């Protein structure tokens, strides 16, 4: 009775938002950018290969200086690299070796890691002693942490597999905001450049636009047919790209509240592990699990290059702040910097 | 290179040496993933052999064991089961005293049928093609005391055999081992345990020595 009425109301609201997003769909992004100049071929080459990890890489993150990057691997290690000279600054031994995410603070004073222990551990790099010690162990999640991103030296947004994203206060150790709207496990995070709102791709084939201060979901994006493993904003902050297990990448517009372009090929039947945009937003770099990364034209949905060179599944990739280099991590325990 | 650059190179060399030593020490270790049902009973196994996941460390005859318990992970296991692709063995604990029971959640399957479905999912997974499974059949005393009253026809209706302890236990073991679709690149080791018995660590030691011999033969190229 009441449940049937609520289901009918939900179906009516879903049809209303579908009709509203259909009414604002006069043209398509492929048709508008059909008369722009295509980029020919992006031939990137491996400059530095970072060796030293002994198990599979699950996460890497760049620093804001575009030189220092941190990597996480299942050997219980968190290596901070100097990408210019290819040498190690720090080797952090983790209490739990089942790391699934890593983050680099914008100030560079801290790094984060987490995984199957359901704990976001924050490490102080710049101590009076020469070691890197654990600052905090944020423990309030039920499931495994999938992604963590730093807002400042005191705030960090974590995505977990217990169908929950959380915002933490590091000094207190408690969580201030609990983002609860999903249905499946949240697998990816992306912070906007202005650091006020973030998107989260989960296992219900949905991406939700959250508000950091308000704590409520603003938009829901339902175009995929499988588990979303990767998410990343456009540099403008008005769009983002998703990478799922149905071998497709999709670009979603925040203001139009729907999907603009699908980055798919018939020769690809394998999922996407990591996505990242270029500095200009023209190139979308997606790391697949057919052992290589594919460079996509973000305005024309055409492949511009292939970053072949990894012997196993490319699990993590990131583009620097200045856009000079792309570092790809994979399950063959190697990090390669492309330029 | 400057003086500070040379000293940074030396620091990186020291870090590399420490990483290599830790990697060799970890490669000489044995990693086990412990799996089972909620009512199958795994805490007695950890007690005999000694949120998030639980790591149990114990040393038996100059071998360092690492036992990982993922039973508290109430998430989609397809998104983290590849983290255990490199593992020496999987320990699957099945109580055979709950063939007559049913799940506390809902009645749509038996407990033994749920254990069989989990075994079929784990054994035939894409990440565990060459990973051996050590099978424990726990609570054999309750199974002996319950097979006299309740027959095994309740769980497996196509049994048609003697209702003794040995034939029923062998039929349960055969039904669990018949779900091994690979049967050519992995082995299933079966033990019958009980609470008042301290012999399970020896069984795990013998099985892991077999797995170590097979892995050394594979690394030598002889398989």
């Amino acid at each position: 009775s009441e449940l049937d009425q609520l289901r009918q109301e939900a179906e009516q609201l879903k049809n209303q938002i579908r009709d509203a997003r259909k009414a604002c769909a006069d043209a398509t992004l492929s048709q508008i950018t059909n008369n722009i100049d295509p980029v020919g071929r992006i031939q990137m080459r491996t400059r530095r290969t970072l060796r030293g990890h002994l198990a599979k890489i699950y996460a890497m993150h760049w620093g804001t200086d575009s030189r220092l990057l941190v990597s996480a691997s299942q050997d219980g290690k968190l290596i901070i690299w100097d990408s210019y000279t290819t040498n190690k600054v720090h080797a952090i031994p983790l209490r739990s070796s089942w790391v699934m995410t890593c983050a680099y603070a914008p100030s560079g004073n801290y790094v984060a890691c987490g995984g199957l222990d359901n704990i976001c551990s924050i490490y102080n790099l710049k101590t009076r002693e020469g070691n890197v010690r654990v600052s905090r162990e944020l423990a309030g999640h039920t499931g495994y942490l999938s992604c963590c991103r730093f807002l400042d030296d005191n705030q960090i947004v974590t995505s977990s597999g217990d169908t929950t994203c959380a915002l933490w206060d590091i000094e207190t150790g408690q969580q201030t905001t609990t983002f609860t709207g999903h249905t499946g496990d949240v697998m990816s995070l992306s912070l906007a450049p202005d650091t006020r709102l973030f998107v989260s791709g989960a296992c219900d084939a949905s991406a939700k636009l959250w508000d950091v201060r308000e704590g409520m979901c603003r938009q829901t994006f339902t175009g995929h047919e499988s588990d979303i493993n990767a998410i990343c904003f456009f540099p403008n902050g008005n769009a983002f790209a998703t990478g799922s297990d149905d071998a497709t990448c999709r670009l979603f517009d925040l203001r139009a509240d729907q999907e603009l372009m699908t980055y798919s090929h018939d020769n690809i039947i394998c999922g996407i592990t990591s996505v990242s945009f270029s500095k200009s937003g023209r190139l979308l770099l997606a790391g697949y699990d057919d052992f290589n990364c594919n460079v996509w034209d973000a305005l024309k949905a055409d492949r511009a290059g292939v970053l072949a060179g990894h012997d196993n599944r490319v699990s993590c990739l990131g583009v620097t702040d200045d856009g000079m280099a792309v570092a790809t991590g994979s399950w063959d325990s190697f990090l390669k910097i492309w330029n | 290179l400057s003086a500070e650059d040379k000293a940074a190179v030396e620091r990186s060399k020291m870090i590399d040496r420490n990483l290599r030593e830790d990697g060799e020490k970890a490669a000489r270790e044995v990693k086990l993933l412990l799996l089972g049902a909620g009512e199958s009973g795994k805490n007695t196994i950890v007690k005999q052999m000694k949120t998030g996941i639980v790591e149990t460390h114990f040393t038996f005859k100059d071998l360092h064991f690492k036992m990982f318990d993922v039973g508290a992970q109430r998430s989609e296991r397809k998104k983290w089961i590849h983290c255990f692709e490199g593992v020496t063995a999987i320990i699957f604990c099945v109580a055979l005293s709950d063939y007559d029971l049913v799940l506390a959640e809902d009645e749509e399957m038996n407990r033994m049928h749920a254990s069989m479905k989990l075994f079929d999912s784990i054994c035939n997974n894409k990440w565990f093609t060459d990973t051996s499974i050590i099978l424990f059949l726990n609570k054999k005393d309750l199974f002996e005391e319950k097979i006299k009253k309740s027959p095994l026809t309740i769980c497996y209706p196509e049994y048609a055999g003697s209702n003794t302890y040995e034939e029923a236990a062998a039929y349960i073991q055969c039904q669990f081992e018949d779900l091994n679709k690979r049967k050519d690149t992995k082995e299933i080791y079966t033990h019958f345990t009980c609470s008042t018995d301290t012999k399970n660590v020896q069984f795990v030691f013998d099985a892991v020595t077999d797995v170590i011999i097979k892995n050394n033969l594979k690394d030598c190229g002889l398989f």
């Epitope: 020469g130 | 400057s2 500070e4 650059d5 030396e10």
Partner: single-chain antibody, 232 residues
Framework: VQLVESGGGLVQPGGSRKLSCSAS????????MHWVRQAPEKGLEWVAY????????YYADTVKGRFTISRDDPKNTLFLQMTSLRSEDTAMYYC??????????????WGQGTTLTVSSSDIVMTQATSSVPVTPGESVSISCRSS???????????LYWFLQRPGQSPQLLIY???NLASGVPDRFSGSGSGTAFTLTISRLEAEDVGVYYC?????????FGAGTKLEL
């Protein structure tokens, strides 16, 4: 963090004496160690250096072949064995820690000091100013000049500034050119290009009066400069 060193005293010329430094408060194994001596009226002078892991050992030309530097990592102890002492070795000896990676702050902590008394192709860092009369609340620009260009090809200018208060060990202010050290107030600043440098203080209290030293870390043997005293 404290480096307490003991030993020395009154020794005859031609004798031998061992200086030991005890470290407590930091990871001793990950820090390179230095010995810096200072004559009773003169400035600082580098003596020796032992790297982390004891793989790289360097000596000054004055004490080469006669001084031995060693460390005891499990015991957190640094040793300096001196052989064939002269009257030129009469100095106060400091143990200095220095870590080396990208963005590190070498020469950050200095030990207390041991008074040793003995009975009777290098970059020349020049500080022409000496004993400048300074009133508080003003701005002071201490200048340093180098005989070689300290700007390396990697964009790093290895110029180190130190402040020695009277009766205290010297304290690092600026480690690389325009890099304020930890615990140093923002009034201190540093700038330069190539061989000419300056250290600018915006407004100064009675805390920052002493002898200001200039050091290069471009290449060994790490020559200092004669200090510029600031008196009230």
């Amino acid at each position: 963090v404290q480096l307490v060193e003991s030993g020395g005293g009154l020794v005859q010329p031609g004798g031998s004496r061992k200086l030991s430094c005890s470290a407590s408060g930091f990871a001793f194994s990950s820090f390179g160690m230095h010995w810096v001596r200072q004559a009773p009226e003169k400035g600082l002078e580098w003596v020796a250096y032992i790297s982390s892991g004891s793989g790289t050992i360097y000596y000054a030309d004055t004490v080469k072949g006669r001084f031995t530097i060693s460390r005891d990592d499990p015991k957190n102890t640094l040793f300096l064995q001196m052989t064939s002492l002269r009257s030129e070795d009469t100095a106060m000896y400091y143990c200095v820690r220095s870590i080396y990676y990208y963005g590190s702050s070498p020469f950050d902590f200095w030990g207390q000091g041991t008074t040793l008394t003995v009975s009777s192709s290098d970059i020349v860092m020049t500080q022409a100013t000496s004993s400048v009369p300074v009133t508080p609340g003003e701005s002071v620009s201490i200048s340093c000049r180098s005989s070689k260009s300290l700007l390396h090809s990697n964009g790093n200018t290895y110029l180190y500034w130190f402040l020695q208060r009277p009766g205290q060990s010297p304290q690092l202010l600026i480690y690389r050119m325009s890099n304020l050290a930890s615990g140093v107030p923002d009034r201190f600043s540093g700038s330069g290009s190539g061989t000419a440098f300056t250290l600018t203080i915006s407004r100064l209290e009675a805390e920052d009066v002493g002898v200001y030293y200039c050091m290069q870390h471009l290449e060994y043997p790490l020559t200092f400069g004669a200090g510029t005293k600031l008196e009230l």
